[PDB]
Amino acid sequence: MNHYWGSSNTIPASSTQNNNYFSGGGNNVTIRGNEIMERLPSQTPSQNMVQASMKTLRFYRKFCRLIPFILRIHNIGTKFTAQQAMINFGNYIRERNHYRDPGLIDHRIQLGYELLYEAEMHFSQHTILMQYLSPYNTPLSDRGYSYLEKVKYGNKSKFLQGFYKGNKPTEF
């Protein structure tokens, strides 16, 4: 097919052979394509939430399949493991699980695929792409963690902890 996800958009293993002297093949499911993505056609209209869920699962699987290459190429593997990044992305997707509009879901899926392709094309900086892959409620594994709040606000309720910090600057 003539698409960025097409089977023919795979880098040949050898300068003269696709995969080997006995058979062909290439890696494009987990790695980048041979050529740039000229067009990104809109997702087909899904009239059923079942189809929307299937598309969402397919997008999640596709994102997971490239998590290793995304982490390796951006030199951001120290921040979290590939499984850790997958878990963080799953939590982020669960944050938007309340959606019930097939059109909104399709638009979000298209935007996410475009963003992933941009990441696959390295067009975006690694420090910005870390926002989606960062742990939800844990410190980054590439830097030390301080438990000053956990110790000082030990067993302190959320309201008390918020009251003790201050919601605005104390000087102005």
Partner: peptide, 29 residues
């Protein structure tokens, strides 16, 4: 199946569908 998919959807790729041929190409790589 590839010919029918290309003919019906001229350039539409809803997802990188994991077919037996695609899996075989991945295994060859």
């Amino acid at each position: 199946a590839l010919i029918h998919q290309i003919k019906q959807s001229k350039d539409t790729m809803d997802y990188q569908n994991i077919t037996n041929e695609v899996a075989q190409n991945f295994a060859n790589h």
